[PDB]
Amino acid sequence: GDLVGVNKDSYLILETLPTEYDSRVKAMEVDERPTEQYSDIGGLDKQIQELVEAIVLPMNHKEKFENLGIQPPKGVLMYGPPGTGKTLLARACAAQTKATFLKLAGPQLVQMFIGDGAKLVRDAFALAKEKAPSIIFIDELDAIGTKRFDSEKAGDREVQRTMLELLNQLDGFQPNTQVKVIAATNRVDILDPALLRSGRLDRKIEFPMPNEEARARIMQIHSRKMNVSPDVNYEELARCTDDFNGAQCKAVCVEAGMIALRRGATELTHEDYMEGILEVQAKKKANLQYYA
Amino acid sequence: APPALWDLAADKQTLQSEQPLQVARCTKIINADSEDPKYIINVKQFAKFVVDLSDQVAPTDIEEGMRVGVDRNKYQIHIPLPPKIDPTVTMMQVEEKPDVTYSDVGGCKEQIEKLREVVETPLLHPERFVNLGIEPPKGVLLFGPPGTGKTLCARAVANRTDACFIRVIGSELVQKYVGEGARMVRELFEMARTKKACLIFFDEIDAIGGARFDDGAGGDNEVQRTMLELINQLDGFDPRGNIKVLMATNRPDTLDPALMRPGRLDRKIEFSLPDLEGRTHIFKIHARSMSVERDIRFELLARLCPNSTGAEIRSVCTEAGMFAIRARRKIATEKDFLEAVNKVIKSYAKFSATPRYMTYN
Amino acid sequence: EEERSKVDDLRGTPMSVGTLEEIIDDNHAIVSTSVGSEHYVSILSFVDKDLLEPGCSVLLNHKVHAVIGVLMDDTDPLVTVMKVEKAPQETYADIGGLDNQIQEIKESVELPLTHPEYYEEMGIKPPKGVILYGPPGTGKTLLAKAVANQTSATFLRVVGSELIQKYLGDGPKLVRELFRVAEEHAPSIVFIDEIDAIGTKRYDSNSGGEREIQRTMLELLNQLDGFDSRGDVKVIMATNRIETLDPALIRPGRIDRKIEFPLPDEKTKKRIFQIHTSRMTLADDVTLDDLIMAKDDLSGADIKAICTEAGLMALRERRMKVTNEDFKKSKENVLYKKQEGTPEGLYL
Amino acid sequence: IDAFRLINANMMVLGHEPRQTTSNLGHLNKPSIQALIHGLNRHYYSITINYRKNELEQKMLLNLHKKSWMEGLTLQDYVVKEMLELAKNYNKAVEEEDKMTPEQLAIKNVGKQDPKRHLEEHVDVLMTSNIVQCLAAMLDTVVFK
Amino acid sequence: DVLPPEADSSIMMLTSDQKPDVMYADIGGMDIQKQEVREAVELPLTHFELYKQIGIDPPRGVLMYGPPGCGKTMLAKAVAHHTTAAFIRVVGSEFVQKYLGEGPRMVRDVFRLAKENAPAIIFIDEIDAIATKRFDAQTGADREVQRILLELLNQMDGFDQNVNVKVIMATNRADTLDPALLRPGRLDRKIEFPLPDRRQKRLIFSTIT
Amino acid sequence: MSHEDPGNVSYSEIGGLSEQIRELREVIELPLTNPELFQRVGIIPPKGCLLYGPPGTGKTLLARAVASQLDCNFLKVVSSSIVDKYIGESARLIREMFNYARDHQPCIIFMDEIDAIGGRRFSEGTSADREIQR
Amino acid sequence: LREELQLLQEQGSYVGEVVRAMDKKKVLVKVHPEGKFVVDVDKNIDINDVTPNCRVALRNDSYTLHKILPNKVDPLVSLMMVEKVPDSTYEMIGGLDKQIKEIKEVIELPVKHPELFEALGIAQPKGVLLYGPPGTGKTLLARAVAHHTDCTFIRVSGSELVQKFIGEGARMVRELFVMAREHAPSIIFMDEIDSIGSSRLEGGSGGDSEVQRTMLELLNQLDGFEATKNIKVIMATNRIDILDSALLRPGRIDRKIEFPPPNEEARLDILKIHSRKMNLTRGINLRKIAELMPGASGAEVKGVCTEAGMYALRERRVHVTQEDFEMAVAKVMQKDSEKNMSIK
Ligand SMILES: Nc1ncnc2c1ncn2[C@@H]1O[C@H](COP(=O)(O)OP(=O)(O)OP(=O)(O)O)[C@@H](O)[C@H]1O
Ligand SMILES: Nc1ncnc2c1ncn2[C@@H]1O[C@H](COP(=O)(O)OP(=O)(O)OP(=O)(O)O)[C@@H](O)[C@H]1O
Ligand SMILES: Nc1ncnc2c1ncn2[C@@H]1O[C@H](COP(=O)(O)OP(=O)(O)OP(=O)(O)O)[C@@H](O)[C@H]1O
Ligand SMILES: Nc1ncnc2c1ncn2[C@@H]1O[C@H](COP(=O)(O)OP(=O)(O)OP(=O)(O)O)[C@@H](O)[C@H]1O
């Protein structure tokens, strides 16, 4: 091992002291519980369960899996045009699983020196095996997971080898079947074909632009705290939402929280939602002028 | 010299304190605790320091990830030292002095009211208390034509209660090799959480966006380090941050910070840029500069040079005094008609020189 | 008195000098000797702690690693490159025929410093400097327009600098740490001439590299942006192309103007050759008419040494005196032609 | 070894320069033993060390040491001829390389830096080498008759 | 007292004489390559009295390049079975270590065994690794070993003229080589290993059968 | 040697290709049991092999199965150990890996995912591409 | 010695390097493996006597200055130089008689004759260059500059170790020029930076453009402002670059020297000089052997002497026969250009 006390010139080890190694590579960040819950989303009900299943099933049903000889999934991919809410949603799943949450990211695996990414991933799994099954979430794996075409070299190539080392840990190392790890990416434009496995990415969910009824449900849960003017039909605001991402929905939600005092511009009512809805892609202006 | 004399005689009392306070070396970060009295500390000597604590410091003052002192004789802890500020790269990135004040023009049509209602006016909370919340959005976004941008932040310093916010430029993230942006955004935000409501500003992504790349490697994956970890740190649970954030740019680039922010940040604006009556208001404050009276007609030539912002017409009133010293003149009304003579020839020469006959031909 | 004699043995004799790490509001000073050391020193006087700033060298007495007092030494390798000096014996009047072109750059740099009365009453103030360049080989001839600026206050002659491409410093502050040390000794002028950063096609040789070296040159690009550009520290750039600077850099500066050096004509050739031969007496047998007439669009330096290459071969005949044997050999150099060439070749 | 004694630092008001009998004081001050030792002469002063006569045991200390160091009994040691083949290598192979230099002493003459003495030390080595082998050959005629 | 001196801890030398390595019967370059190799490689071993008569310098330079075919080390092993000789078997990248102070000892001890005793042919395979010129200071470990290559490039000038030394060299990339390497006055003999093509097929099929 | 894997059985569990199942059993096991065929006929046995992917599976399954079944005689190499650490030396690792390969016999070495550590010298990035060339 | 060894015993007597001198009475001392230390008096070496960039003996007690030792900056420079250049006295090279004819006063006139420059009322030239197809003198022109001018050989890159020793890196516009001031009659040479690599004119004329800009900026120095004379430049031409050097320097401003192709009178003298180191028969005619080698270069004449000496070595004879010189020509005639495809 390492970390054995040797005292001055005496050169005698009295006791071998824990825990593992080393420095800030040891503990990335200690997290407890999220505030939000999985009930803050809508329209994803069928596709969110695919993520909810794979993480929840090994907890309680592990005794039922040993009877039928079933291996629980490990790698899971969460992607969609942002905002898809995957940052808080996959984090809100750590409260239901009761497992300890550890914050991690692609850039977090990058350091100044060489070979440090290979030291970080082997460092987390060492704490993962000791701390019992847990939940580790990473964000934007496709960035560090880009093998491009030719070389050399990619700046993150140290991590793109470490990500493939994670595939080797999910290949040759049996203990890596423990402490399921959650992954999320912005785009599937760059995806490794070797990622297919139960230990590797297994459940991979394509999150499209939420439905017009789904965009109304997710934005109502966010606006339930604020005080809004009465007479909200919910019919026009749902239909006026098309192709818009969940983050652009909160952009209207955050906008809808400013309408109380004055604001001073006059929103009145029922035009609030369609205001910030058009803000990003609209509004003419032109149309015609300078042209026909 | 009086401070030099007395100090040389004041060290005679210091050589009584000579031996103590020497043992303070070195700075070391603790890692784990085996028991209540004993901890372990990683020290600059590359080993780990398993230590007790002196009776002067309570055991609750020593927590994991803290830099503390030691007494090299008895080896017990002396005093914890929290402070250390920046590496060599980010210490320059800290703001030094205000510049680019917005008193030169006002008021703007929309973009001034767009942001001021979401961030500035709620800072004193005549509004946010009753109006929100819905914890307010943490930042805004500035972009558009170059005139005008970042100028509103300096005028906000005079209108902001104690104390002024430190602003940070985003074009210094590239020095040598890679990985400096990793440790950069980490510790500067850890200091930002200690800034207790002091805002943090970001801008100048166009300063690195002129060329910066030929074929590869970019430029893309190595940039995903700083930009994603930024948003990742921006997505951090605690506080976060009570110091808000301030974001700015020139072009809409890039998309990843643009679609991540609306769930947290809000209120993007588009410059604006001057107006007809806006350009003459710049000449109103410029009347206090140079030597200028109220007899001049500003709107005469103001409509003939659109999209000059406030920077070009500043050089117009600048080079105007350049010829005024060469021609010995003084007051801009003297000089009534012939101030516009140097105003028309200098402004059109600064844009460009093109033959006018080939235009219609 | 007895002060210096009493306290000389406290710090020394064989004391060591470290570097100040940080300053604590509790009066405890943390000094770091090389490498990786700390300490606590409590001194309430002799500071001068504000002028110090962190990252500086401070004394350490033997007993025990404490500071008797702080001094300002060196400072840094960059401040040394300003000297020396320049301020030569040459003046702006030593060149001629550019008087119409030089009056724009000369009056712009003379607007600050001397004649400040109309500079301060204005309260606008274009202290932006200029940008120089020109063919065929000029742009250092426009530096000969700054030889009058070299004699004005403090000047810095820079070609490719040092720390730009070779090894980087910390931030733009290198020019700004020059500005704070200049503010006591000010005014000052920092010239920029013939930037070789982007001038080289293939860098020497293969390095870290074809991509990142552009990003450490991008560090220069943001260093001149700059944050936050206020005063002068005059900036006068000389190089082939100005397009290397991004439009975001022009916003802080410098937006004043840039000038080009045109090919000097026969009136300028004779005038430049005359002033160089004015102070130092020329020879009467050599006429200036056939020299300026036989050449078309050539600098003032090229007309000079074509008479030197005649005097070159002249000493092979062992003549220090003016002799008519060289007059024909100098007229032979006029018949030799070859002074200018450039494509063309076409009939238009 | 070393010896030192602490002088009182509170004596700074009084004189710092005892003692009498400068004989052992001047000899103790030399060699002065480098610098830092004399740099520690602040607050300290050295002291002389002499040996009262142990000659009772000191006579046997030389006797017990040399009696066991001479051939172990003085008998037992009486590498021999094999070292002579190694000696005659040092009496021949080393000779010709040392006798090229007298040829280098002749220049000739004279373009090389002089004087240079190549005589020692190998000449006296060859002297003792034959003194060894001749008195070692006497062991035959000493032990026998 | 100093060392004899010796080769110290560098390399370590010899290890070629253990034998065997590769028999020259496969390809020896009979009557074609054994000619150019005769005069320019194994004649420089000594042949002292013959070179003073002609007055032409038989330089140490032997260059090899353009695999396939291999050749190279086999030509070093072919001469090993012709005349018994102590060969230095090394690589371009192997001598880079954590200590740059040993460098000045290496090229000294490597080239001191050629001048004092001459059954010596020194072979260095794929020098293009250290031939890469890296500017950065953190890479100074690489900057020092190409000075090592340039130091032995100076030591070859200290040999001429003339007696004695021989150095054979092979690399797979000739573009990264410094201009001082192949500049005249140091390597005056460059033997390009020809592409085997059709002529060596029946030759390599004869030795394999 | 801290690795591990079941099988034995996993050799023939994949099922295909039958020609790759029988050939990998020969080139490995036959030189161990019967060196006579090489010395009597006078042919050089293959000292290396290359298994690449992923057009299907069986790379890590079939090779590591014989490895784990060969017990104390084997050598494993992960692509993460070549970069090692800042100013680290893997050149002595490559010489050590093949040095102990000449000790335990027949040794078997697995190198997986060499695209990152197999760096070409055509385009040499930063300071880190040369240490890959070494 | 035993007493002297004691002073050197404890920590040992080190060697320090003084980077700069301070007004505070402390002198900076740098150890080679370690960092930069500092030490005060030191009353043996006075404060004003301490000069930067020098070598001093470091004591083992107070780390003071025991002795003073000089440093040699130029021998490290000249090491790279003497590695890259031989001597070549005037008799060693042919066809150079016209070169040193009109090039001699490019060297010694600005040194010992400042007066005749003002006889015509004129200043010094800024350099020269040669242009043409090879030809020989790529080595030989640089070979002659060291022995003729008696100047530093500081040369164009040059790898890798041109930038390292002088400052942090060589910008070629200052360092190379500053080191040219240390030697009073010093000129500048650039070799080669002319070859086919780089036959595409991109890297060939692009890397030289910094030297092309260096010689242009030198013209402006001695015109507008400078205190320094004798600063000049000389170029060596291998392939192309004839028109590239002619655009900037069409004999302007200096004596016009064309890089000589192999010529009749050029092959006569270059063969007689290189034949003085060999034993040759006296029944040989040096006139016919020079005319039988059209084209090639004077360096090829040296190659003929080597090839003609290899076969004479094979026959085991002390001399060489002119028939074997014809065998040396037959070896080099097979490498000429290419054919017959494309043209005819
Ligand atoms: N479909 C959705 N349902 C509920 N909330 C959403 C939805 N989409 C976005 N949000 C909200 O918008 C806020 C902004 O998060 P955002 O969606 O930008 O992160 P993200 O795009 O999931 O990040 P990443 O793509 O890196 O996983 C979140 O706090 C989240 O609660
Ligand atoms: N045919 C199979 N039978 C049983 N298990 C298999 C099979 N193929 C793959 N596996 C499992 O997948 C893991 C990886 O195996 P292998 O390396 O052969 O495929 P792979 O290279 O990962 O494929 P990909 O690169 O497409 O993911 C092994 O741990 C193994 O348990
Ligand atoms: N539209 C405008 N109206 C009035 N003054 C302006 C305008 N645009 C710029 N200015 C003036 O120009 C001066 C310098 O502005 P500066 O070039 O620093 O803007 P900037 O910070 O570069 O803009 P951005 O952040 O968009 O790049 C300011 O003092 C400001 O008064
Ligand atoms: N007669 C021959 N002709 C050609 N090649 C042969 C002959 N005999 C053996 N070889 C080949 O030479 C190889 C070993 O020679 P050597 O060590 O010189 O290779 P190498 O030059 O290092 O290889 P590389 O060119 O890839 O670096 C053997 O693998 C063998 O195949």
| Strands B39-43 vs B48-51: parallel, antiparallel or unpaired | antiparallel
Residue A282 in tokens: 């609209």
What lies within 8 Å, CB to CB, of A93 at 6+ separation is A38, A51, A52, A55, A135, A182
Backbone angles phi, psi at A99, to 5 degrees: -75, 155
Residue D82 in tokens: 């094999």
Whole-number Å distance between alpha carbons of B141 and B265: 8
Q: Which residue has the tokens 């020879």?
A: C283
Nearest protein CA to atom 11 of ligand 1, as residue: A85
* Interchain touch G–E (≥3 Cβ pairs closer than 8 Å): yes
Nearest protein CA to atom 5 of ligand 4, as residue: E70
What lies within 8 Å, CB to CB, of C226 at 6+ separation is C172, C175, C249, C252
* 3-class SS of residue E144: helix
Whole-number Å distance between alpha carbons of D9 and G333: 97
Distance between alpha carbon C175 and the CA centroid of its chain, in Å? 13
Whole-number Å distance between alpha carbons of E170 and E87: 14
B95-100: long-range contacts at Cβ-Cβ below 8 A with a sequence spacing of 24 or more?
B95/B166, B95/B167, B95/B168, B95/B201, B96/C176, B96/C228, B97/C228, B97/C230, B98/B154, B98/B157, B98/B164, B99/B154, B99/C228, B99/C230, B100/B150, B100/B151, B100/B153, B100/B154
* 3-class SS of residue G67: strand
Are E121 and E164 contacting, i.e. CB atoms less than 8 angstroms apart? no
Q: Which residue has the tokens 């050391």?
A: C37
* Interchain touch E–A (≥3 Cβ pairs closer than 8 Å): no
Whole-number Å distance between alpha carbons of B351 and B308: 9
Reference A279, options A248, A242, A256; nearest CA is A248
- CA max distance for chain B: 93
- CA max distance for chain G: 89
* Interchain touch B–C (≥3 Cβ pairs closer than 8 Å): yes
Distance between alpha carbon A28 and the CA centroid of its chain, in Å? 16
Are G202 and C187 contacting, i.e. CB atoms less than 8 angstroms apart? no
Whole-number Å distance between alpha carbons of A39 and B198: 35
Q: Which one-letter DSSP state was computed for residue D12?
A: G
Whole-number Å distance between alpha carbons of G283 and G326: 15
Whole-number Å distance between alpha carbons of A109 and A83: 24
Ligand 1, pocket-test mutation among A86, A206, A215, A243, most atoms within 8 A of CB = A86
Whole-number Å distance between alpha carbons of C278 and C94: 9
* d(CA B258, ligand 1 centre) in Å: 13
Whole-number Å distance between alpha carbons of B170 and B150: 13
Give the technique used to solve this structure. cryo-EM
Are G238 and C156 contacting, i.e. CB atoms less than 8 angstroms apart? no
* d(CA D129, ligand 1 centre) in Å: 98
Q: How many residues does chain F have?
A: 134
Residue type, B157: V
Are C289 and C267 contacting, i.e. CB atoms less than 8 angstroms apart? no
Q: Is G137 left (phi over 0), alpha (psi -120 to 50) or beta?
A: left
C316 CB-side CA count, 13 A: 18
Whole-number Å distance between alpha carbons of A106 and A120: 11
Residue C173 in tokens: 């502050």
HEC profile of chain C: CHHHHHHHHHHCCCCEEEEEEEECCCCEEEEECCCCCCCCEECCCCCCHHHHCCCCEEEEECCCCECCCCCCCCCHHHHHCCCCCCCCCCCHHHCCCCHHHHHHHHHHHHCCCCCCHHHHHHCCCCCCCCEECCCCCCCCCCCCCCHHHHCCCEEECCECCCCCCCCCCCCCHHHHHHHHHHHHHCCEEEECECCCCCCCCCCCCCCCCCCHHHHHHHHHHHHCCCCCCCCCCEEEEECCCCCCCCHHHHCCCCCCCCCCCCCCCHHHHHHHHHHHHHHCCCCCCCCCHHHHHCCCCCCCCHHHHHHHHHHHHHHHHCCCCCCHHHHHHHHHHHHHCCCCCCCCCCCC
Ligand number, closest to the Cα atom of E23: 4
Burial of B230 (0-12, 13-18, 19+ CB in 10 A): buried
G207-214: long-range contacts at Cβ-Cβ below 8 A with a sequence spacing of 24 or more?
G207/C200, G207/C201, G207/C202, G208/G241, G208/G244, G209/C199, G209/C200, G209/C201, G210/C196, G210/C199, G210/C200, G210/G172, G211/G156, G211/G172, G211/G235, G212/G244, G212/G248, G213/C137, G213/C194, G213/C199, G214/G172, G214/G173
Are E186 and E157 contacting, i.e. CB atoms less than 8 angstroms apart? yes
B342-350: long-range contacts at Cβ-Cβ below 8 A with a sequence spacing of 24 or more?
B343/B301, B343/B316, B344/B301, B344/B304, B346/B315, B346/B316, B346/B319, B346/B320, B347/B301, B347/B305, B347/B308, B347/B312, B347/B313, B347/B316, B348/B305, B350/B312, B350/B315, B350/B316
Q: Which residue has the tokens 């010689």?
A: G215
Whole-number Å distance between alpha carbons of A78 and A87: 9
* 3-class SS of residue B15: coil
Residue B61 in tokens: 């003052």
Are C15 and C62 contacting, i.e. CB atoms less than 8 angstroms apart? yes
Residue G32 in tokens: 């080679």
Reference A209, options A242, A232, A258; nearest CA is A242
Beta carbons of C208 and E132 less than 8 Å apart: no
Residue type, B315: S
Beta carbons of B31 and A23 less than 8 Å apart: yes
Residue A83 in tokens: 């905002």
Whole-number Å distance between alpha carbons of B263 and A252: 9
Reference B272, options B120, B153, B107, B139; nearest CA is B107
Reference G257, options G132, G135, G136; nearest CA is G132
CB of E139 closer than 6 angstroms to any ligand 4 atom: no
β-bridge mates for residue G227, sequence order: none
Whole-number Å distance between alpha carbons of C59 and C66: 7
Q: Chain C partners of G114 at a C-beta cutoff of 8 Å?
A: none
Residue G136 in tokens: 């020989």
Whole-number Å distance between alpha carbons of A254 and B263: 8
Taking CA–CA distances from C252, the nearest residue in chain B reads: B100
- Against chain F, the chains showing at least 3 CB pairs within 8 Å are A, B, C, E
Are C56 and C50 contacting, i.e. CB atoms less than 8 angstroms apart? no
CB of A267 closer than 6 angstroms to any ligand 1 atom: no
N-to-C CA span, chain D: 52
Are A156 and A55 contacting, i.e. CB atoms less than 8 angstroms apart? no
Reference A234, options A221, A247, A243; nearest CA is A221
* Ligand 2 proximal residues by C-beta, below 6 Å: A 171, 194, 196-197; F 14, 53-54, 57-61
Helix, strand, coil shares, percent, chain D, to 5: 50, 5, 45
A284 CB-side CA count, 13 A: 6
Whole-number Å distance between alpha carbons of A141 and A204: 13
C83 annotated ligand binder: no
Ligand 4 nearest-atom number relative to CA E75: 18
Whole-number Å distance between alpha carbons of G99 and G258: 9
CB of B311 closer than 6 angstroms to any ligand 3 atom: yes
What angle do helix axes A212-223 and A246-256 make, rounded to 10 degrees? Answer: 40
Whole-number Å distance between alpha carbons of G65 and G42: 6
Helix (H) or strand (E) holding A68: helix A45-68
* C-alpha dihedral (C318, C322, C328, C329), degrees to nearest 10: 40
Residue A76 in tokens: 């899971």
Ligand 4 nearest-atom number relative to CA E207: 1
Residue A205 in tokens: 């969910």
Residue G318 in tokens: 């002390």
H helix intervals, chain B: 2-14, 88-93, 111-115, 121-123, 128-131, 151-159, 180-194, 223-234, 255-260, 276-286, 299-302, 311-326, 338-351, 357-360
Are E187 and E64 contacting, i.e. CB atoms less than 8 angstroms apart? no
Whole-number Å distance between alpha carbons of A131 and C303: 85
Q: Chain F partners of E95 at a C-beta cutoff of 8 Å?
A: none
Residue type, B139: G
Residue C249 in tokens: 């850099």
Residue type, G151: C
* d(CA B127, ligand 4 centre) in Å: 84
What lies within 8 Å, CB to CB, of C346 at 6+ separation is none
Q: Which one-letter DSSP state was computed for residue G333?
A: S
Q: Which one-letter DSSP state was computed for residue G62?
A: S
β-bridge mates for residue G188, sequence order: G233
What lies within 8 Å, CB to CB, of E171 at 6+ separation is E64, E65, E92, E125, E126, E127, E128, E131, E177
Whole-number Å distance between alpha carbons of D70 and D51: 28
CB of C230 closer than 6 angstroms to any ligand 3 atom: no
Helix (H) or strand (E) holding B293: none
* Among A31, A139, A257, beta carbon nearest to B134: A257
* C-alpha dihedral (D132, D135, D137, D141), degrees to nearest 10: -170
* 3-class SS of residue A73: coil
Are C192 and C236 contacting, i.e. CB atoms less than 8 angstroms apart? yes
Taking CA–CA distances from B176, the nearest residue in chain F reads: F126
Strand stretches in A186-233, DSSP E:
201-206
Residue G67 in tokens: 């002795």
Q: How many residues does chain G have?
A: 344
What angle do helix axes B311-326 and B338-351 make, rounded to 10 degrees? Answer: 130
Taking CA–CA distances from F126, the nearest residue in chain B reads: B177
N-to-C CA span, chain A: 78
Taking CA–CA distances from G245, the nearest residue in chain C reads: C341
Q: Answer whether the bond into residue B180 is a cis peptide, omega within 30°.
A: no
* 3-class SS of residue A24: helix
Q: Which residue has the tokens 């019992």?
A: A132
Reference B267, options B129, B143, B106, B108; nearest CA is B143
Q: Chain F partners of E136 at a C-beta cutoff of 8 Å?
A: 127
Backbone angles phi, psi at D37, to 5 degrees: -65, -45
Q: Answer whether the bond into residue G307 is a cis peptide, omega within 30°.
A: no
HEC profile of C171-234: CCHHHHHHHHHHHHHCCEEEECECCCCCCCCCCCCCCCCCCHHHHHHHHHHHHCCCCCCCCCCE
Beta carbons of A83 and B263 less than 8 Å apart: yes
Q: Answer whether the bond into residue D32 is a cis peptide, omega within 30°.
A: no
Nearest protein CA to atom 7 of ligand 3, as residue: B310
Reference G191, options C347, C290, E179; nearest CA is E179
Beta carbons of E139 and F130 less than 8 Å apart: yes
Measured CA to CA in angstroms, residue F94 lies from F2, F78, F103, F130, G69 at distances of 19, 12, 14, 15, 46
Burial of C202 (0-12, 13-18, 19+ CB in 10 A): middle
F71 annotated ligand binder: no
What lies within 8 Å, CB to CB, of C333 at 6+ separation is C306, C307, C309, C310
What lies within 8 Å, CB to CB, of C315 at 6+ separation is G105, G109, G113, G116
Are E124 and E92 contacting, i.e. CB atoms less than 8 angstroms apart? yes
Question: Smallest CA–CA separation between F96 and chain B, in Å?
Answer: 28
Whole-number Å distance between alpha carbons of G233 and G253: 11
Helix, strand, coil shares, percent, chain B, to 5: 40, 5, 55
* 3-class SS of residue B41: strand
Q: Chain D partners of G62 at a C-beta cutoff of 8 Å?
A: 35
* Among G61, G62, G247, beta carbon nearest to C341: G247
| Strands A135-137 vs A101-103: parallel, antiparallel or unpaired | parallel
* 3-class SS of residue G190: strand
Whole-number Å distance between alpha carbons of G146 and G150: 5
What lies within 8 Å, CB to CB, of D45 at 6+ separation is D4, D5, D7
Are G38 and C57 contacting, i.e. CB atoms less than 8 angstroms apart? no
Are G308 and G284 contacting, i.e. CB atoms less than 8 angstroms apart? no
- Against chain A, the chains showing at least 3 CB pairs within 8 Å are B, F
Whole-number Å distance between alpha carbons of C305 and C291: 11
Q: Chain F partners of C216 at a C-beta cutoff of 8 Å?
A: none
Whole-number Å distance between alpha carbons of B318 and B314: 6
Q: Chain A partners of F78 at a C-beta cutoff of 8 Å?
A: 165, 168
Q: Is F34 left (phi over 0), alpha (psi -120 to 50) or beta?
A: beta
Residue type, B131: N
Are B331 and B291 contacting, i.e. CB atoms less than 8 angstroms apart? yes
